[PDB]
Enzyme design. Structure first.
Site, PDB file in Angstrom:
ATOM      1  N   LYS A 241       1.950 102.016  26.595  1.00  0.00           N
ATOM      2  CA  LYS A 241       1.100 101.657  25.359  1.00  0.00           C
ATOM      3  C   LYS A 241       0.847 100.129  25.346  1.00  0.00           C
ATOM      4  O   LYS A 241       1.734  99.303  26.016  1.00  0.00           O
ATOM      5  CB  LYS A 241       1.684 102.299  24.192  1.00  0.00           C
ATOM      6  CG  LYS A 241       2.873 101.595  23.664  1.00  0.00           C
ATOM      7  CD  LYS A 241       3.791 102.318  22.709  1.00  0.00           C
ATOM      8  CE  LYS A 241       4.787 101.548  22.078  1.00  0.00           C
ATOM      9  NZ  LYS A 241       5.489 102.165  20.885  1.00  0.00           N
TER      10      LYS A 241
ATOM     11  N   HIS B  71       9.456  96.373  28.495  1.00  0.00           N
ATOM     12  CA  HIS B  71       8.300  96.009  27.708  1.00  0.00           C
ATOM     13  C   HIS B  71       7.771  94.661  28.570  1.00  0.00           C
ATOM     14  O   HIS B  71       8.569  94.202  29.554  1.00  0.00           O
ATOM     15  CB  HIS B  71       8.874  95.433  26.463  1.00  0.00           C
ATOM     16  CG  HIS B  71       9.595  96.316  25.650  1.00  0.00           C
ATOM     17  ND1 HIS B  71       9.091  97.212  24.734  1.00  0.00           N
ATOM     18  CD2 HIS B  71      10.795  96.533  25.294  1.00  0.00           C
ATOM     19  CE1 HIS B  71       9.735  98.134  24.356  1.00  0.00           C
ATOM     20  NE2 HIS B  71      10.976  97.539  24.366  1.00  0.00           N
TER      21      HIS B  71
END
Length: 195
Positions: free
Chosen positions: A104, A74
């Site tokens: 994403k 992340h």
């Protein structure tokens, strides 16, 4: 068996010279990817379906032609610095040299995963037995360093990492998770990232 195959990988990574990523120049802005229903840029297909809060990017010719086997990162930014951070990072995320075939990013207009973890980077395997090659792993190590470096030097504020994730103290923005594992610092993959 495992210890040796780990060390096989480990010492190969340290044999490679520093890796450089040719930065993509025609990159969409944050607002462009927010509207991209289904749209190609730099070999990545971009989709923003109302089905979730994310804008997905997916290289139609993967460089790692095998399975996603659990391993991901992340990137956590302060909420208001998210579009900026995307602009700063887009050249790397759309680079033809990036080792990340699928990522994403949170759509800041759909959200209330808006306080941190706004980028997810999915690692896929490129070998048989869902394994990772040493070059891939090197490329990923180098890439994280390079994301870190670009954010820090534009003085971007870090956001809040998910409690689930692990990171060394020298990562200010990036953090790691394996989905299969519900001792996350012991993960083979992770050890190869930081040591």
């Amino acid at each position: 068996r495992l210890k040796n195959n780990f060390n096989i990988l480990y010492n190969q990574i340290r044999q490679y010279p520093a890796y450089y990523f040719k930065v993509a120049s025609n990159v969409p802005t944050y607002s462009d990817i927010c509207q991209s229903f289904s749209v190609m840029y730099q070999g990545f297909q971009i989709v923003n379906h109302s089905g979730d809060v994310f804008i997905h990017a997916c290289r139609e010719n993967p460089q790692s032609k095998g399975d996603f086997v659990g391993d991901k990162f992340h990137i956590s930014i302060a909420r208001e610095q998210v579009p900026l951070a995307f602009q700063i990072l887009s050249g790397l995320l759309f680079s033809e040299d990036s080792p990340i075939d699928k990522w994403k990013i949170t759509d800041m207009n759909r959200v209330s995963v808006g306080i941190g973890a706004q980028f997810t980077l999915y690692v896929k395997s490129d070998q048989e037995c869902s394994q990772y090659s040493a070059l891939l792993l090197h490329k990923i190590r180098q890439f994280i360093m390079c994301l870190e470096s670009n954010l820090l030097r534009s003085k971007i504020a870090p956001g809040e990492y998910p409690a689930s994730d692990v990171r060394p103290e020298d990562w200010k923005y990036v953090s790691y998770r394996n989905e299969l594992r519900s001792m996350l610092r012991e993960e083979p993959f992770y050890r190869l990232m930081i040591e």
